[PDB]
């Protein structure tokens, strides 16, 4: 089992500094290079930096926009890489993932799952969640309800439904940045004979400010 | 830098048929040791990229077999033998010969099918929101086909534009079709000095606007 996990991302301040961890198992890692590549609206997938194994003498390169303000360095004995991130600016804001180069020759072979950086100095607030349940009677043969996570900074937040029990029937929509605030839609449509009768909750997690709200969908 | 080149910003597949996507270096991507490092990756909506091919045209573990790749120098082309509903997502080359490392800008693989009227559902503030001072109406325009569609608010008639939030899913991976989200944003008070809401809703399949709305006094 290969795995790649990203971890220290998150909200941080313009001109601070901001450290990334990327913990490796299931692969040669003495025998790979590992590099970090982030995403970002403005230029799709952009290579930052990497670093070379022991026998390569553990050698550095950087894209040139980063150059001298991120540190790229590895812990072998940890089997893990790190992007320790300077002078932070807005451009440096995007998802940042951590892919492994086994030198048997394969490319980027293997990528962690990405850790969200959001460069900015506005302050992290949990958001409101609120049900939305339909105004009339349901007939017909399915109903579809939601629940609006609104007023929360920075992203991401998750969204479940019966904690997961209901997921075939979901769409949880991208979050719309408004006045330094996110606001986000996720609707459930099941069949008629499910809800109001059983009872649909949906679970809303913001892990910046460690908030955890379970609302339930009642009739109107 | 060397520039990775993905003319097809999308292209329109039907499930079954055979497609292959391009891309084009603006340098030859041949090594002094004679490898091709040209490779091509897929990122499926909201997860992380993966690898497909490397170098050219080798299938990456647990890549389907409906995958191959071709190309040389400054041209290459990733094919499907038959695209699968599943394949949606956007699918990226890059050069992995000299630094720094380079994508192309990518094309993403959009799933063909018959026409599907969205199901229009509007809710009013709910009760919990209202007591804080606030009145978002929502409107959910869910499981549409073609991914084009308009949607206008009307306040007592009158229609708004300021305060209205969008957003829209990617193509579903199950049944290729698309949803979207519209919030009307109001403070209680403005939401208080009208009585009738409506999510308005143009699409390829109907003549006439999709009509859904509801009325604050009641």
């Known amino acids: 089992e290969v795995t790649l996990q990203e971890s220290g991302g998150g909200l941080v301040q313009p001109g601070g500094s901001m450290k990334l961890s990327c913990a490796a198992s299931?692969?040669?890692?003495?025998?790979?290079?590992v590099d970090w590549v982030r995403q970002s609206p403005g230029k799709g997938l952009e290579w930052v930096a990497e670093?070379?194994?022991?026998?390569?003498?553990?050698?550095?390169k950087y894209t040139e926009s980063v150059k001298g303000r991120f540190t790229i360095s590895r812990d072998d004995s940890k089997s893990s890489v790190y992007l320790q991130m300077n002078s932070l600016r807005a451009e440096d804001t995007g998802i940042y993932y951590c892919?492994?180069?086994?030198?048997?020759?394969?490319?980027?072979?293997?990528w962690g799952q990405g850790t969200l950086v959001t460069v900015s100095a506005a302050s992290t607030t949990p958001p409101s969640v609120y049900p939305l349940a339909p105004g009339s009677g349901g007939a017909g043969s399915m109903v579809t309800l939601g629940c609006l996570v609104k007023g929360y900074f920075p992203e991401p937040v998750t969204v479940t439904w019966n904690s997961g029990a209901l997921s075939s029937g979901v769409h949880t929509f991208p979050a719309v940045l408004q006045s330094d605030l996110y606001t986000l839609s996720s609707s459930v449509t099941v069949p008629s004979s499910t809800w109001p009768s059983q009872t649909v909750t949906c679970n809303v997690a913001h892990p910046a400010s460690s908030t955890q709200v379970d609302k339930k969908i009642v009739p109107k | 830098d060397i520039v990775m080149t993905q003319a097809a910003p999308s292209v329109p597949v039907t499930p079954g048929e055979s497609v292959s996507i391009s891309c084009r270096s603006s340098?030859?991507?041949?090594?002094?040791?004679?490898?091709?490092?040209l490779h091509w990756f897929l990122q499926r909506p909201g997860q992380s990229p993966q690898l497909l091919i490397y170098?050219?045209?080798n299938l990456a573990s647990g890549v389907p077999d409906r995958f191959s790749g071709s190309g040389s120098g400054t041209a290459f082309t990733l094919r499907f033998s038959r695209v699968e509903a599943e394949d949606v997502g956007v699918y990226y080359c890059?050069?992995?010969?000299?630094?720094?490392?380079?994508f192309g800008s990518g094309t993403k693989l959009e799933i063909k099918r018959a026409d599907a009227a969205p199901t229009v559902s509007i809710f009013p503030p709910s009760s919990e929101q209202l007591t804080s001072g606030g009145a978002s109406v929502v409107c959910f325009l869910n499981n549409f086909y073609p991914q084009d569609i308009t949607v206008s608010w009307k306040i007592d008639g009158a229609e708004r534009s300021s305060g209205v939030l969008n957003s829209w899913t990617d193509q579903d991976s199950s049944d290729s079709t698309y949803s979207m989200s519209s919030t009307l944003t109001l403070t209680k008070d403005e939401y208080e000095r009208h009585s009738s809401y409506t999510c308005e809703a143009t699409h390829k399949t109907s003549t006439s606007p999709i009509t859904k709305s509801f009325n604050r006094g009641e």
């Open positions: 892919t492994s180069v086994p030198q048997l020759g394969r490319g980027f072979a293997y």
């Open positions: 299931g692969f040669t890692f003495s025998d790979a290079w």
């Open positions: 670093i070379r194994n022991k026998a390569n003498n553990h050698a550095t």
């Open positions: 340098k030859s991507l041949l090594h002094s040791n004679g490898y091709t490092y």
């Open positions: 170098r050219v045209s």
């Open positions: 890059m050069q992995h010969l000299e630094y720094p490392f380079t």
